[PDB]
Amino acid sequence: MFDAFTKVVSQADTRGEMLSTAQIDALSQMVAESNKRLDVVNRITSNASTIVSNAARSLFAEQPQLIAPGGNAYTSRRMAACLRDMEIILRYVTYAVFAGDASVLEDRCLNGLRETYLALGTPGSSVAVGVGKMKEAALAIVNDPAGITPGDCSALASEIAGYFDRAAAAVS
Amino acid sequence: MFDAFTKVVSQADTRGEMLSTAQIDALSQMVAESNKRLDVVNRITSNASTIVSNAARSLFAEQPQLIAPGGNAYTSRRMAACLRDMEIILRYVTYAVFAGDASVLEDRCLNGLRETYLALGTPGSSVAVGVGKMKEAALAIVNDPAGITPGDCSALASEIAGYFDRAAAAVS
Amino acid sequence: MFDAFTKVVSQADTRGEMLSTAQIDALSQMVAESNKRLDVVNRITSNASTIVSNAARSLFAEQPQLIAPGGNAYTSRRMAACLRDMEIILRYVTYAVFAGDASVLEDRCLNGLRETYLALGTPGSSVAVGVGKMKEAALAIVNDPAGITPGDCSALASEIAGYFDRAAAAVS
Amino acid sequence: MFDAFTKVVSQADTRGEMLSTAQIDALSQMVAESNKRLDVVNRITSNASTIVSNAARSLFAEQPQLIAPGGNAYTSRRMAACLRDMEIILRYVTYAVFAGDASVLEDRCLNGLRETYLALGTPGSSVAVGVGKMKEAALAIVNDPAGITPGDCSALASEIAGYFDRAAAAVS
Amino acid sequence: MFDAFTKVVSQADTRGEMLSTAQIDALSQMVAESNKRLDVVNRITSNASTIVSNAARSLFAEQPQLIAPGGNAYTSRRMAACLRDMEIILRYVTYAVFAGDASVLEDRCLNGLRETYLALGTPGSSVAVGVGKMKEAALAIVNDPAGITPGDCSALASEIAGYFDRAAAAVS
Amino acid sequence: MFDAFTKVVSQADTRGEMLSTAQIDALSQMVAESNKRLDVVNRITSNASTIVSNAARSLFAEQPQLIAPGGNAYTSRRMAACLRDMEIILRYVTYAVFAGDASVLEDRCLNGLRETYLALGTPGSSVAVGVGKMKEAALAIVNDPAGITPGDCSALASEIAGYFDRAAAAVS
Amino acid sequence: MKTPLTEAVSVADSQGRFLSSTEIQVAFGRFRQAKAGLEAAKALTSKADSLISGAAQAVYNKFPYTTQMQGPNYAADQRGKDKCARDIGYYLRMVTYCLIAGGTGPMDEYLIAGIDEINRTFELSPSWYIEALKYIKANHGLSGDAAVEANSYLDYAINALS
Amino acid sequence: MKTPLTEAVSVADSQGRFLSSTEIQVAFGRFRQAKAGLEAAKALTSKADSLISGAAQAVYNKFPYTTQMQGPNYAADQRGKDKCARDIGYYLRMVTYCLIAGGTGPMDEYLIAGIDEINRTFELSPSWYIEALKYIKANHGLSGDAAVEANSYLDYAINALS
Amino acid sequence: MKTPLTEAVSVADSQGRFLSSTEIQVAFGRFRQAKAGLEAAKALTSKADSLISGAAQAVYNKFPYTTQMQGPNYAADQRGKDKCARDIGYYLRMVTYCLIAGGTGPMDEYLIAGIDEINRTFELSPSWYIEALKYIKANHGLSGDAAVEANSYLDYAINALS
Amino acid sequence: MKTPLTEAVSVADSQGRFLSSTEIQVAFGRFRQAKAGLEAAKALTSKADSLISGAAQAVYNKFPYTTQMQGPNYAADQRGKDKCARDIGYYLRMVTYCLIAGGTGPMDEYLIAGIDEINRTFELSPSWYIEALKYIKANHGLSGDAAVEANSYLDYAINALS
Amino acid sequence: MKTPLTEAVSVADSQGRFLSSTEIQVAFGRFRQAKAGLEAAKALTSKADSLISGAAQAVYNKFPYTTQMQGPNYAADQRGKDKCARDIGYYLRMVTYCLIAGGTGPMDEYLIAGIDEINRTFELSPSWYIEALKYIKANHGLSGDAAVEANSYLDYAINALS
Amino acid sequence: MKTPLTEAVSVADSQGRFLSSTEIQVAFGRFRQAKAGLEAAKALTSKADSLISGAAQAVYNKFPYTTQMQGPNYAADQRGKDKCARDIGYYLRMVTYCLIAGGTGPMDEYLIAGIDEINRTFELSPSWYIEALKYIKANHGLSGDAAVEANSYLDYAINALS
């Protein structure tokens, strides 16, 4: 896995060259906004169980066939597994946010996911909807102005939204 | 794997329904004839050695090329594996009779057997012949009127022949 | 794996035959020139590091793109692995000369090498050039008339050459 | 492990003899009481949770130093282990009643316990008190005259108390 | 293992109390001197090789019996194992300085060492002599006033020396 | 394990000495009488099964308590284990004759054997008696004057007896 | 799915053995008990509606706050009363499947496995379900072996929840 | 040791579970059958001496060279004849144990395990013993379930030798 | 336990390497945060009593049945209120340990591991504790980084309970 | 296949090393012995027919019942005698392969592996083959090293059957 | 790659945990340090040529024989001097990568792993390189935390070579 | 310790087999070669002092700096020269051991394993030892097989250092 720094170091090594000041300057901007990045990780993580459960409850209310006898989410074992999938995805999104790079998410989570669900019979489109619901909830939490130094996090918020979208498209 | 009971229970759950009086009556008939089923299992198992050796002996006599040098059953290691396969198929067939369902046989024995024989170069058509030979022998043992309370075992005898048939067809 | 003797014994068994007087005579001429075969194994093995190191030096000079940044032999990890592969191929070739049969080289070395290199992105044709270089040096070393009882090893030289060639063809 | 039957069989084999009529007659009157034995097992098992929690709650009430900070049952991890230990002893105790022999309890449970506790720093006497409470509760349940065919289960009751006592001694 | 913080916490838990104010203040001056601790670790680590080789070279000059045929440091395997042991010990000393607690050193390194050497026939007093040589050198490096902000590190040098002493004493 | 040559090399190394001309001569003699040594290995090995069965047959005749119900060689599992132990010891004795050194025998077979037998309750003294019978039979086979070039095999016979004797003493 | 028949074949298979008298004896015990089990299943099925609704009421009356407190995990509205009766029906259905199969297999498979993450995530109290099962135990009106076995499965669920 | 009761406990213990109605059914089967098994062991024990002598005689009749050929593995002398009748008595004793325990465990434990190595080493033929077992099968004179269970253990041994 | 310093050393040890600049930076982060964590711990310690008793009353208020319902798992008597206040004081004490250590380690070790088995066994509802934790969150009166860190451990426990 | 050359290569490969003087010494032994071995293989091949027909009569004479008892496993008929001669021919052909390869490998791979399952299943006595092997050993008329090596392979087969 | 952000995620992932305060502190430490590391990388980059050319001359002065001896591993000719400068350039470049990443990771993966096999194979002396690294340490002209972190990577490489 | 005899016993022990003609053939090659090894070993032992002096001097002539440069790893003083002569002595002694044992075992065990770490740690060039070995090869004055086998161990050492 790469973090924001090593990702650029790696592409530079393939050209066999040192980083250009322009490349370093981009890393500096990221270092300047790191406090906002850590706040977003802390806020999402601190509301993990809520984001997941509320998203899960909404999914099933909208798509009741998922939990009706015969549905992929019917029976305790499958429900538990479904809930676990939601939690895993959210966990990996927070990893990418913290590292500043999507590799860990793509590499250790989304890789082969679409195929996995196809083989299982798990509606991937339903997973995407669930991921979308978590995204909306997470972003609202990240953008709450209460108990935090006022400032702009729209950039970070846009990056966070990107990871949530990579996930949803990967199982769509 | 399923037995006769869990096989019906599993389908019912998929429809979220409780077994119908019709279904519970059917399962009741099976319980009624259970003594006969256990007899057939005891009789076949009790003569496993005889059923296998005689079938092998007969198979090699009919297909001599199988034991000529260069033949798939030539050399000690290949003859022992062949005899083992016959025994394994018989054992799994008796498992299916005892459980009243063919899943154990299909799943743990016949699954991918055709492609295994195909990769080794083992003629599946010859294996089918050996199986059919074990079938005729096994049925004769089950239907023997000596030393057992007289009654009709035709249905059973038919269910048993079906298991041998599935096996023979899976390697052909 | 087979050695010169068990290869023939193998063919014989499949036909269910005893070796002909002619076949035994051929195995006889082999035992007769065995000292020469042992010298070739001792000579190549005693100069292993010089053959590999000199072959690599020459390979990299003829194909500098290999050691340029981004190249498959760039970075110590990749260079060490590259030198390792050449030592491995040379080792298996000397095993074949020792045994008097290629089975060992084919089974434990060449098998599935093309694909492995293709998957890694390693240029198989470059590996073949390195192998060809090792062949040149090996044969020269084998045919050095110094410090050895004079004799004709031309037959052996071609056998050895055949193994190196077999290896080069397997990767490129 | 042995059950009532193989236990007698084992002692007989070391003497090289067949069971005497007396030995067979004893096993016979035990088979006659088998219904009561299975009821006692079913009853204790059906109330496992109650038996364990009520015994533990009662033990901690009279031995507060066990749950006070620093005590061996203080902290969740340790309390969990303690509850688990009691459930485990009850489980093996029920195995013994079911099989009609104390070997499974001694061999797989009590064996080593005294020392493993001593090394851990766990009080064996306290554990013995907890086992004793479980015994009281267990026998009151087996002896409940409600919803069961009336008859004498006194002999069985003593056998059970015996296993419990075996356990309490093994650690006290 | 514990660090300076978890050590205090684990002790408070066994007592079921919150840290006193005076204790918390103590952990404060500790946090205040942290920069000096980190330089200490960085300096020793950066000279690990020099500290080990020089100490070893000096030990052998003082006790030539160790490297004479039949000596415990004779042969390449044993010499290498010996150098490794000094490196390992030095490594754990730096872990202890970093964590601010000796537990990691005692538990993962010093535990049962004296016994291990006695069994191997390795002379602990010579190891102790080697540990002492490393201590003298490590302290000289930590205290070197070159290229560092001037300040007092006497309390640190004192704590560092204490870890080296625990080691020397554990093998003696 | 050592063989006749490495045993001497190991002793020489601890003293840092090259082999003396006397030691070279000693080894030279060993090499000179080596055909005799190989004949003894071939002869014992070639009669392995009859040496074990006859020694076993004779042991149980002299000590009936062993195969009587309750005896350590009673029951198929235990008798088979007994026969296997005798074969295992004979195998290791032949290894030592071949190598010209007892290390292989002492290290991989006799080490910890007495304790094993003590724990299992197997009479080591009876094993020692069985080993002695195998010695008798093996020496008779080695000393057989038929079908071999005449010559004195005195010294060797004495060495062979020495290994059997070591085995007997290890469990006596 | 643990049932006398499947478990027997499983042990045998794992040992690479043909079935023997031990397994035949397992089968006898199962078929002997099936008579009682099949009748109980039939009985519970016929009194299902009554048992489910009655159990839901017993729980509401035992834990009055379950119909007073606001929140998706409670029954202060129709949606939650419907979900609750549904859940109780799941337990009753699993119990009749066990009677039919002769073992806890079905309940282990479709209900027990994972019930913990479920109740934790949705804040559902095990004691509510324990109360429902106790009510069913006291009201199915079965007797003899049919009742003994039925209660063994109802009690199995209660133990899994406590 | 393969027997209904020990295997039921074993399986459960391996799964870390309390016994359930499944294991209880396994016990009902063992106890329904024990009535016939203990009666069979009693009978066989009574006819032991005759079954052993008759079985040994049947072997010699089928393989006369065994009473003639010189060799420790044969029965040309009294020593060999005593060893033979002793071995047959072992098999019969093992069969009665199986009936008492209700499984093949005793035979597996004390006789089947390691039998191949013994027969090969001492050059004893499996065919001889098979003949002996066939004789006991045709002459024990058991009836009903007693005969069925007894015959299952004799055929089991026979299958182990072929 | 889980703390920056212990974790850094453990990873290095597992890799068999000396500490490098990577682990030094971990230490810098810990020491930079220690200032606030230590002050927060001090504050919570001094306001513990009002915090524990206030969190208790808060629970009794959102769940009134807990004080009028009979049972050992409830707080209807003095004995139950005492155990409850004790339990709440445990959570708070663990939270101050986390601040001092700079990681969830203390709480993970002494409280979280095994909590599921305890709550299930003694029928304690995690909902009750979550309410208590929320109260402490809203009333500790901390500010700055001290509050953010304190709240992260309070939310950590809540998440461990839902 | 266990031969001096293949084993030398195998141990080297397992250790990941080039062939050293140790493995070259192994080959020296192989090629030195080969002269006698190849000579022996020729000798046996020419006497094959008489060695086989002779060993067969040697078995029939030692175990007269094998030519009298009716049954598929015996040689009372032409079919059985042909099977027997064939089997003995297999053992001899394997012995010449061993002499040619310089090891037991050919026999281990094509004949010894699984021979026990075959003799048991088809009820063929190992003693019959041991007798045939002893005959060949006493009648090949070889001498010198050729006889010592040839005999070692015959004795190896005898040991595998006892 | 051994870097603070990568290791923090790795341990957490291996523990299947969400990130917590422990890992957030690791990030704080990395970002505090990045300020100097990023500037230090810029400085070294601007004086690369002068540093490389000077480190080489320093090696040639300590080991004058490296410019006189004939052989491919030496720099008596132009090919060799060019190779040498290239190698030193690689060392300097990896150092800057490490300042950027905040750990030895880039160096470990691109240079350290395998360096032993390379030096032995091409007969390159570690001593030559250590002298070049020593020269860069004393001539980079960095100060503060930038110098301290930079030297830690230079000393790390030196330790790897001795 | 790798020698023909211990390796033959090892491959056989690993397979749980008795020694066979394959291992005896291994022994034959070993005893045949022993004649040359013993002679080569005795000869080298009598020229030891002469070979060690000439070898050391050969290294000094090839790498003059080793006698001028300062440092404990160099031979510019009597101390260093003595160490060098001693090390070379060890190499020659190991070689005679290999000739006596018929394998690389003695050298692999007493010298080769760990040599890498030693040369790195004490800053000794493998190249110095390679030259000393080349000198011994060119000046031992052995002939025939004695020379061939002796040179194979010298070259083996050379390959371990390059």
Ligand SMILES: *[C@@H](C)[C@H]1/C(=C/c2[nH]c(/C=C3N=C(/C=C4\NC(=O)C(CC)=C4C)C(C)=C\3CCC(=O)O)c(CCC(=O)O)c2C)NC(=O)[C@@H]1C
């Ligand atoms: C072609 C490859 C070259 C060549 C070879 C050649 N060699 C021999 C003879 C022998 N080689 C050995 C080998 C060894 N002796 C040892 O002690 C060791 C180390 C363990 C080895 C590898 C031996 C013993 C001989 C025979 C004795 C001798 O030196 O002559 C021959 C002669 C033929 C033979 O089989 O004896 C030949 C022709 N000759 C060349 O001209 C090529 C460069």
